[PDB]
Assembly symmetry: D2
Homo-oligomer: 237 residues x 4
């Protein structure tokens, strides 16, 4: 039903729905079966940064994930998003835990979108930055198990009062205002997103991952989308 | 009911509710009776620019209105907005026509708000810019007679198919996302707004003006607020 | 001697040094013989906009040139600039006239460069914007025939007191501060440049073009670089 | 000789040249004898943040200094800088140690200046941000004892190989490009600066302080300006 473009930080290989056989970062165009992936060493308990970049000129969606020691994974995919997404969208973050589990903690999130016309100067633009999340975060739409705490963090999936990640959890956070991410007459339609995160588990394996996504304005968690579907897709096709 | 902080571009003197006896720009703190005003030469049919600036350090709300020939009016008012506004707000533009009339055309509007904590780097932030308005402007909430056209403009009050401003009109446009404009622990809470406008009339006098405003999230046009109340206040007190 | 990376707006085909046989936009990596070109309809006497975009993740230098009626040309080239440029650079604009001539007028120019480390937040950054040039432009280094006028424009090549472009002219403008455009540990090193321009001629054909370029800090106009070498290269190899 | 506007973080009271009898933050208009001060609790060994704000509309130079525990000092001064400074300037940071000493370590520094004309959109602008300083910092001019290290910091005054601050030291760092901080036709000329710092001493008292300053482009350390003159002024008048 929904239309999804996503960058996934996938901690758990589900090798029978196309995942490679290692943790990986991927670009998802209307399917959980990534159009392109790269091997990712998730560092348990450390704070990672993800950077996502697209412009309508180069037409290349790119995504790098790094940790402070310097190890990083990158994935790029050539795609014209004018042909995938509706003109108006909501942008958001998603995360899942299923049979295996992890914290899906967001410490900060920023986004910029710009439409530059022909036309001579300038420009429609939207920019937000969160370095601290609050308990009543009025410019965020929280779906499912997602919560904003008193500790300044966004917590996408269930965590218990002792700091333990729960299994079978799904949560999303979407920015409140719709975003105008393309316009047929824009000479440049570009966007960038950045988020920092803390994934930790005392579990045999961490699962399932975190994703930045762009969707139709009325997007909601699809029925049965915990575990490997990352709160983004109603099936694995 | 609503809480209003506003900068008004007041084209029409209503001298029995406190207006000075000339067109004027003013700072409105919870009353249409400006806390401070300056004389303003509105230039019929020309494109003006208004710039509005506040920070929580200097605690001074300032506002300059200029035209291309260089003539400008400025007004400043010392005020601590932490003590006036709720923490979460919506920001918007308002305009009125009553017995006399004018176009209240907005050609562009931009806003930035930032919260900088102690704490060491950075920062919550919100920035939007509109240089072109569209027919279905999904990130704006249009109240009353306000319309976005096919001509890339925001039209706050009624205009007829021949380009004639109608009397007794009220319209507002508010940005879709709530804004976090103060937080007790922010070392700096600042905001800036800019808009461009075209006020024109073949009328004996233009009325009633345009305002940039900040309000509670659930703000709506008060009953009977056309003419001199500028779509902001339910009375003249 | 110098190291050059450039986007050229080439108005004049020199078909024996590799130009295609039409006006074209191109990406120049250490040679006037573009690595990649696209056909460009230069609109005599109209104000064009050029947008140039690169990031170290997608590793794709892209460049679109448009006019208000909407016609635009785009060119993209995959290149890792970490392997071409020195770490510290100056950025600038260049233009030429030779046997044929044109105005090479710049009406505005903006640039942003960012280095984002691993590392967790943020960032080294440089941003400038010129919408008005002044007679004594202290943050620009003017080379050759380039002048800043009283009319708010940057004029790269010779124009006479009657507004006529002179032949055999070369001029460049470089931003005063060196720019740190890559750093081996930056997870993201990106840059964007935008300029607007007015190319006009009553000449049998316009020549020779305008270029945005990045060079070593001590870059200067190479000996004999008028006409087809665009003030960038000491030869045509 | 030089023209100085400064915000000083003054750790050491020199009560016979006008200092109050406590550590203080102050606004300096062409004199070390501050036009306005506020009491400042310098927290030995902690990372402080200073924020400096001015606009040509409100005409109020403001400055807050904070630490992570939340304690902050603020000082504001009404002044029209169009009447104090030359149009073109350099911006910088200064620090001193004399008979008593301290580290004057800068961990980050950012600056934005904007000129908005009448005129309708936009704008000349300059923005830099340093979160990491490098050993060969080509966009900074280092004066006196100031050094940039391998540890990513700017070190304004002498420190010895064991990490001990030396007495009688003076150092400054100025951004490489001149800045156009006012223009008589700008409807808005505004600026903001932010820096973070680490002042530490095992000394009977810390001295002498750190300052952000704006000066003529050709500004240099005045003869005999260590200790209480903070590297800014040739005398105490
Ligand atoms: Ca998976
Ligand atoms: Ca009135
Ligand atoms: Ca050529
Ligand atoms: Ca002192
Ligand atoms: Cl599975
Ligand atoms: Cl399925
Ligand atoms: Cl009345
Ligand atoms: Cl009333
Ligand atoms: Cl030739
Ligand atoms: Cl040659
Ligand atoms: Cl003394
Ligand atoms: Cl003295
Ligand atoms: Mn996957
Ligand atoms: Mn009034
Ligand atoms: Mn060519
Ligand atoms: Mn002092």
């Amino acid at each position: 039903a929904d239309t999804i473009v996503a960058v996934e930080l996938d901690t758990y290989p589900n090798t029978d729905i196309g995942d490679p056989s290692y943790p990986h970062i991927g670009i998802d165009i209307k399917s959980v079966r990534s159009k392109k992936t790269a091997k990712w060493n998730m560092q348990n308990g450390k704070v990672g940064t993800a950077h996502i970049i697209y412009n309508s000129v180069g037409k290349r969606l790119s995504a790098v994930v790094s940790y402070p020691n310097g190890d990083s994974a990158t994935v790029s995919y050539d795609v014209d998003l004018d042909n995938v997404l509706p003109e108006w969208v909501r942008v958001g973050l998603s995360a899942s835990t299923g049979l295996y589990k992890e914290t899906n903690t967001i410490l900060s999130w920023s986004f910029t979108s710009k439409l530059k016309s022909n036309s001579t100067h300038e420009t429609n633009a939207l920019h937000f930055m969160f370095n601290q999340f609050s308990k009543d975060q009025k410019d965020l739409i929280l779906q499912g198990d997602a919560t904003t705490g008193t500790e300044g963090n966004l917590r996408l999936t269930r965590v218990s009062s002792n700091g333990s990640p729960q299994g079978s959890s799904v949560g999303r956070a979407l920015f409140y205002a719709p975003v105008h991410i393309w316009e047929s007459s824009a000479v440049v339609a570009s966007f960038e997103a950045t988020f920092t995160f803390l994934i930790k588990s005392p579990d045999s394996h961490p699962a399932d991952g975190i994703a930045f996504f762009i969707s139709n304005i009325d997007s909601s968690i699809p029925s049965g989308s915990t575990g490997r579907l990352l709160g983004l897709f109603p099936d694995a096709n």
